[model samples]
Target: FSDLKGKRILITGSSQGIGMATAIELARYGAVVGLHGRKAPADPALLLGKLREAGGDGAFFRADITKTAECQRLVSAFVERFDGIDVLINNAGGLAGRSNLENIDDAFYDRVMDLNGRSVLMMTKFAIPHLRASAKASGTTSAVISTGSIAAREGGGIGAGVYAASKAWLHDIHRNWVKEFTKDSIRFNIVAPGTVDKTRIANSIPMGRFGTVQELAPAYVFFASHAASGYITGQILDVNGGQICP
Candidate 1:
């Protein structure tokens, strides 16, 4: 069941953090990974070196996911490179800084939503046809895995109301896809991570501990693995170190 050789997988926001960690795990499984970031990082060779050393195959693509046109271009480029993708990890998103309604201006709101909310909508839209075709060709289940936040259930921390709402939006949209795409053999799911170590939000988690990206990455692998999660869909796997909503 660990055999993922030659499977094409695309992961967004993989330049660092949870996205990169998940890509590493998938690489260990022998998947051909496509890593997407808004632009090249300072040490591009470091990321490439790690993947190669880990015995995984991958290439990098740059695109600002907040733009629909860029999202389309990114997907097109990945599909062209790998022929098609068996799994798409829509992990590109963030709080975009926190602000409550009173202090949050319209421009900030738009930016926040564009990054965390609209990107998912556009990425999934462009990816559906490819995911559909890949599933049919392989006669196997394909997966669409997204990253949400515990904020979605807890309404976020302090000024994170907008961020929380955007995540909630992701959960809702992801659920709709499960019902809409069951016949297509594509599964949709979300992983909501709690405050992780090395992040500003770590102080608020109830466990008094922040989750590691490594710990969070397996949820992505499990969901992508037809061998492990064939029967799972439209589910939200929480990795919050016991953090919960009130």
Candidate 2:
């Protein structure tokens, strides 16, 4: 459980939603988390204060990751904060906007792509050297865990198709990244979760019950902890209910 203390972890899009939930969980694990987003969280000190109280430490980073420069800036700031990166979670994502097909315009497409495709690649691309360095120096492993959703497999609804396609792209690239970096010992994986319980589409789950933000955090801990998942990589750990099991 002490596996995360001082393990400089930078998570993007952490101002809210799934990213925020995961950040809090990592904090309790004693990780020094770098929480980033386009905007700052309310009671910003409250989150950081809780991080410290939970036996971890962190600071919120302000950066809109749809651009390459901001991506670089975000990574640069975190490295400056902790001196190195041990884990990079590309949890920064969104539906952006949606339309089935004809209704989807160019601006809608690129904005969503910028947030999803652009952000993930640039963020990981910028963090590559640091992740490699982290594993090389530690002699254990460094990790890159991307947070996706059931959409990749289920084929996001007609309206949110772009989000689905983008997630599929992410899931695919992680496998490729492993082939490119496994020798570097920088493991790559994705965590795909179902609707959080509060936003649960009750009929969508066979069990008539669903998940909470808390449930979504453990798989991340497993992937981020080398002791738990050292031999694992290039796989998607679906944290969804019996909803979609592929």
Candidate 3:
């Protein structure tokens, strides 16, 4: 983590889990963080209170990012609230349960993809203008960090092909974005987490343990810091406790 005194960050799926942890850590580092969630979760208000108590600035925004319109609206609202976005944490994603390929119909495939993959596209699509402006205005590099999973590499376990495939798409697309957006001074990166603690997949990890969200948050902080990772771009950091060391 580097100095982020005046930077503004928008973290989606930040109501809890890895996203929430990342938000708190960034706020602790002095960045004004925007906490985004699909709906008002039970914990965001509590998290926001803690952030403020720690002398950090933040606000919560609600939007079902799967919808392109809502994604755009969320971006607009965040920019209006924070004045600009220096870093966009595209962390709002999840597996829509599990189903075998034979059971995954078009609707099922579409739902999972839209949640895990399309949301990233739509959010980043709407946030680009702000990112471009921030790069120029701040005289500091801008960054886009999307959450990825080890499933993208191992193809996941039973009934997770669709989830794995969607994550794979996210990883590939972010790599391509590095080339496409480098000229704009916006860096694109990925943080792929392995089996996390208390989750169903923990038993599958080689570490024989799950990772805490607190443990995973620092990777995002590393990418967000221009001083710490200014020259790094288009990289995938595996935070899976050696489960899938790539």
Off by over 4 Å in 3: 198-206
* TM-score of each model, in listed order: 0.94, 0.95, 0.94
User: What are the per-residue Cα lDDT tens digits for candidate 3 across 21-133?
Assistant: 88888888888889888854556678889777765889989989877888888899999998888999999878777898788899888888888888899899888988999
Candidate 3 local accuracy as lDDT? 0.86
Clashes of each: 0, 0, 0
Which window of 10 residues has the lowest lDDT sum in candidate 2?
197-206
lDDT per residue as tens, model 2, 1-246: 577878999998876767777888888888999988785446668777877887789988899888889999999999998899999999987787668788888899988888889999999998999999999999999999999889988788778999888999999999899999998899999999877753357777765677888888889888999988999999899987778868
Top TM-score prediction, candidate number? 2
**Tens-digit lDDT track of model 1 for 54-86:** 778888889998889988999999998988989
What lDDT score belongs to each candidate, Candidate 1 first?
0.86, 0.87, 0.86
